[PDB]
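Co-fold these.
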Amino acid sequence: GSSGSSGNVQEEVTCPICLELLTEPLSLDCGHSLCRACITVSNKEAVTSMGGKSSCPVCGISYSFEHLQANQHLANIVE
Ligand SMILES: [Zn+2]
Ligand SMILES: [Zn+2]
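Predicted complex below.
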């Protein structure tokens, strides 16, 4: 019937990789939410070559799952 009401929200909480709905993603270091599957990797066939760290397919920024819980008190100024 009417348009414009109950429809004013702009949020980017959708896995840009698989292009699906997010139920409980994991905010990366750079600031991106992805699925638990798209991130975690089971099938590892990296033999001839080394390396094995979930990268950021959204933009591409080497991050880690430790820096988040590395510092709690001593925080650096950003602004
Ligand atoms: Zn996904
Ligand atoms: Zn990112």
